[PDB]
Design a protein around this ligand. Structure first.
Ligand SMILES: O=c1c(O)c(-c2cc(O)c(O)c(O)c2)oc2cc(O)cc(O)c12
Ligand SMILES: O=c1c(O)c(-c2cc(O)c(O)c(O)c2)oc2cc(O)cc(O)c12
Lengths: 675, 676
């Protein structure tokens, strides 16, 4: 706290407290570990001649570097005080000492427009044509290498540029590692006046005008985008300028002028020999409502992008063909032709995000619902079962949310494929859809968000039969109300029935039913138990419910009953054994009590070649039946049973649930199929 | 052709139009794309002759195009007054608006056509009419702007003055967003026109405490524009609330210090702006504004990654300027790895932790990376692509942050599994790579540089593909796909061998050398199929996901059991189909005379009735019979010798799984294979 009380004194500019602590034994070279600012650094920055002299009296190193490698001498280039530079010069080895990015004290006078500081460094040996030497990470991407002339032109300091070109013999056509001269840096100053002045100074000295800057843009191209006829006139005064130069996207200087509705600039470019066959300029000027420019062009007289979606395919071809203004990276047109669905605000339309097909949800930029949607999506990019979030683009008044384009809604999807499966077939599709919903909602909870509006319209299907969660305009962070999760689990239960019933029961119908009514509507015991656990849960239950026998295939259910019936203690009917102790409950009346009286009598006799009405002997009955069903002597028996998995679940619907319940958290859990 | 003759209207040749209108061309012909009739195209180009010539032929001046604007409305844009006169006696309402609510009066304001504006005023046009648009736009509070707002946005000082005085315009009118013309004025890039209109609007009583885009006040827009003149003009109003905050809670003074505007900040303090809305002194200090620093002196984010955790806490804590949506600082503390260009650093992209690969904005490899990523967003096993932000010279590619490289990961978990345990992790890694590379091919891209440094592991042990800086579209060269499958083969061995064999060592080996390095027959066969996928490669990676390499040891044991339970194997019917496929002709394999290679005690006890023959069929019967009875009480002695049966049979006869798989691959008995 002795060194730390001296850094507080320098900021308060109490000169006496500094003298009191420098004689008390405070470190003058003490660098704070965060950014490395020494007391000598902080004094020069705030321009206090007294504190810089007082600390230099106590041996404060003027070569002491900060985190970015800048000495207090270099900082004096920023401050611009000439007598601070005088105080530090006799203790500096090289005046061209640069920080880790290559910034010398000379450059810091140019960047900040410190003329009196710039001149002092000039006569004292500072290099005017010094390129910045930075680290090898920046060098490998052609960064750095700029001079003081470029720095001064970028900042628009007309005073500094004039002195460098005349008094200090600066190279006007010097290049950085990117290949850019000071002319490019000049046209980037938003002030129209300052840019005009520096351009004149640079052109008269011989700066190359056919150079490339940001986006392969020439100075002529930058002048058009700035909408400054004066800057264009100065450039076209050179005859060697290449007017037919193309930028990254292949747009020429003339093309951008017509696009931006600049009558005189477009006229000037044509009169200087710019080619008019680089685009349909007349139609562009026609849609701009520039009658004068349309006529002027009259007197001087391939497609390949293929969309991936099938439903929206032909519509995407049109949206790519037509011209639209870009909202950042998004190409969108608000029309009934490109509408996807209606929402509580703005609706959903087709769009193109970096030439990628996306579905666009629109919000008023002030809407809290828009914020809740974009907040939840950014956290669920790692969620595989949530629609892929591209980004958000603002037009100033409309919040555009671009999402992965899907073919049909879950409600629509179940309808379109309703006629595929015979009515008495294992519904594999229902398990694939519901499981992916468990994964989406489960991982969404671990991400701290709850959907709050789970309905089949909010569940989409892509072209590859994948199911995704979407429409988080009503989502919340469930930390604020921990028990609000129950709504998603309740809606998940209704979705289990909605999907099992292949969509025949409407979701509105399911919302108006009570819990007991919904349970009755389930066709089997596996669905009834699953929905119960969703309405009556106990943080990661949704992952644990993926092992529920609902998601077991009929072979896996058949395989599991076989494997239990192969237990040694069931086959020997060891009443003392653990396995029968678990299967011996208390409970109500099961459908497999006196199970011998409900099976075909022909099968009963051949298998007895001592079955009791216990559960253990039923599974033993399944084990012997399963291993031997295909033997020659059982061909007649095989016709009675048919497919055995369907047979036992048909005669005893509660069998799978009953075995699962008793063996859930036991050693015999190992007989369950792997999940 | 008859209606396509209307192309002459574009050339505005009067002779051909009069000649073809009597030839039978539709004057109201609307092209189906946008609905531009010949009368529409004429008013757009301002042709006095063609409007009269077409009005002679009954051309409807109320005929609407796609956006609902009549040729009369278009005349508001053109500004020719005699076109308005030619159409006025044939228009029901002068305030007829298009589908967005643009009337002929408003179209004169947007384009600054004063002579058109004056004519429409005295003929009944509504000056304070708000735009009535469709309910899609209305439900997001879009539209509703007036002619005063239209003129202020475009900066036409002439039109604003006439509207405020001669035409009784409401100065404090609000749109559906809640914005007045003053907000539309401050958005004009022209400094002069914005200043003039602001004075005209303020003198009439325009509300200055209004909110625009992003809850920005008029004062805030002047500060962000860096225009001292506009700030003084606004602070001349006494009712202005100077301490009003935008959406992000930034006040007028706060934004001024951040942007290094000395005098504006000084002016705001002299007008009563609060100084306790932020650490203003330090902000001016890091801007190197010595005078502004002196002047002011006189007056929970938790990262999810574990490895990079403490570093993300610092990057969120420190202040950095934003490169679009990316917060990044190039420092050794936040370095991840070095690349051929730019290296890899930590960053925050929309407050999310991301790994950033850096390129020069001109680099073609940077373009190939961002090109391949945009196509692989739907690929679950490719690193999640967040977005790309440009700093003007550096292409920043933000990707999902992963913990360790596959090479690093195998080392860190090398000590986990006892050497004689099923390598489950190797199957999870390779399968996800097959899914990643497979779907990448379906997306039309090939990796071309598959190496373990290009395979990442997230926090949840998930494996992802990355480093698409050398990817190509394989349509130009279809057979280059085999290279990715060849590198995939080396990855199969590299992952099975737990990384002990270096990848460079494997790249210098030949095909036959690499195959020899495989420790078992399942790996040996898989690697072969990747080196020889054939010219009909197509979707071979999907078909190889059913290869017994990805079968669990339980699934292999279950399948050999299930085959041994076939009726014709238990009865040893040599004529049957099942045995003909397995045993045709009178054997070279490790299970020939397999009865002589197992412990004699197990061999004898199993013989409890014809004994087991040295045929393959009885081996599967031997596995089935052993499996069903292994846990019986009287077999406790036998159980100890074999141990885990799956491990036993695959070790004594390594080719058993491959031999059964090969013989039953495309048969009815394929059903015994595990489900995929
Ligand atoms: O791609 C999408 C999509 O197709 C639909 C959609 C919704 C309906 O209600 C329909 O009837 C319909 O045909 C499609 O909604 C979406 C909602 C999102 O939040 C995000 C999307 O990407 C989609
Ligand atoms: O998240 C990433 C990541 O962590 C690494 C990485 C980490 C290491 O620890 C290394 O040693 C290494 O070489 C690379 O690379 C990446 C490469 C990408 O193209 C994209 C990424 O998202 C990552």
């Amino acid at each position: 706290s002795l060194e730390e009380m001296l850094t507080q004194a320098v900021q308060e500019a109490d000169i006496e407290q500094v003298r009191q602590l420098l004689e008390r034994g405070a470190d003058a070279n003490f660098q704070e570990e965060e950014w490395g600012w020494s007391p000598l650094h902080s004094a020069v920055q705030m321009d206090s001649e007294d504190l810089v002299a007082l600390l230099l009296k106590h041996g404060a190193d003027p070569c002491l570097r900060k985190r970015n490698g800048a000495t207090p001498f270099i900082i004096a280039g920023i401050t611009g005080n000439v007598r601070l530079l005088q105080l530090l010069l006799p203790n500096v080895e090289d005046v061209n000492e640069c920080d880790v990015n290559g910034f010398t004290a000379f450059m810091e006078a140019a960047v900040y427009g410190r003329v009196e500081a710039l001149r002092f460094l000039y006569e004292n040996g500072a290099d005017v044509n010094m390129h910045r030497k930075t680290k090898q990470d920046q060098e490998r991407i052609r960064k750095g290498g700029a001079t003081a002339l470029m720095d001064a032109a970028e900042k628009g300091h007309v005073g500094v540029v004039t002195i460098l070109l005349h008094a200090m013999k600066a190279e006007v056509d010097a290049r950085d590692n990117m290949g850019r001269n000071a002319l490019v840096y000049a046209l980037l100053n938003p002030d129209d006046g300052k840019a005009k002045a520096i351009t004149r100074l640079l052109l008269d000295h011989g700066a190359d005008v056919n150079v490339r800057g940001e986006g392969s843009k020439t100075p002529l191209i930058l002048a058009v985008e700035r909408k400054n006829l004066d800057l264009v006139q100065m450039l076209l005064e050179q005859e060697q300028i290449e007017v037919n130069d193309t930028d990254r996207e292949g747009k020429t200087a003339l093309l951008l002028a017509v696009e931006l509705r600049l009558e005189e600039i477009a006229k000037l470019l044509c009169h200087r020999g710019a080619s008019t066959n680089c685009g349909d300029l007349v139609a562009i000027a026609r849609r701009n409502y520039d009658s004068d420019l349309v006529k002027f062009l009259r007197l001087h007289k391939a497609e390949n992008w293929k969309p991936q979606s099938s439903r929206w395919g032909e519509a995407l071809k049109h949206l790519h063909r037509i011209w639209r203004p870009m909202i950042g990276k998004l190409k969108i047109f608000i029309d009934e032709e490109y509408k996807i669905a209606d929402t509580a605000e703005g609706g959903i339309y087709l769009g193109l995000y970096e030439d990628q097909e996306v579905a666009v949800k629109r919000f008023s930029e002030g809407s809290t619902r828009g914020q809740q949607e974009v907040s939840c999506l950014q956290s669920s990019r790692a969620n595989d079962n949530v629609v892929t979030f591209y980004g958000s683009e603002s037009d100033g008044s409309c919040l555009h949310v671009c999402l992965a384009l899907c073919e049909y809604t879950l409600q629509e999807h179940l309808a379109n494929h309703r006629g595929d499966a015979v009515p008495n077939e294992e519904d594999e599709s229902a398990r694939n859809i519901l499981s992916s919903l468990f994964k989406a909602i489960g991982e969404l909870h671990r991400s701290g968000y709850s959907h709050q509006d789970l309905q089949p319209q909010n569940i989409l299907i892509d072209s590859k039969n994948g199911t995704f969660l979407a429409d988080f305009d009503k989502s919340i962070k469930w930390a604020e109300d921990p028990q609000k999760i129950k709504r998603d689990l309740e809606a998940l239960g209704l979705l289990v029935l909605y999907v099992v019933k292949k969509g025949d029961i409407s979701f509105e119908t399911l919302k108006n039913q009570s819990f007991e009514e919904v349970i009755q509507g389930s066709p089997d015991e596996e669905t009834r138990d699953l929905i119960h656990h969703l309405f009556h849960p106990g943080e990661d239950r949704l992952s644990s419910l993926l092992a529920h026998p609902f998601f077991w295939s009929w072979e896996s259910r058949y395989r599991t009953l076989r494997d239990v019936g192969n237990e040694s203690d069931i086959k020997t009917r060891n009443q003392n054994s653990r396995i029968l102790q678990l299967l011996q409950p208390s409970e109500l009346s099961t459908s497999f009590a006196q199970w011998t009286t409900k099976i075909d009598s022909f099968v009963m006799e051949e298998m007895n070649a001592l079955y009791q009405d216990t559960l253990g002997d039923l599974l033993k009955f399944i084990r012997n039946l399963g291993e031997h069903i295909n033997e020659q002597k059982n061909k007649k028996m095989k016709s009675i049973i048919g497919e055995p998995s369907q047979y036992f679940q048909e005669k005893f619907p509660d069998l799978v649930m009953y075995v699962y319940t008793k063996l859930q958290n036991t050693e015999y859990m190992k007989h369950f199929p792997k999940t």
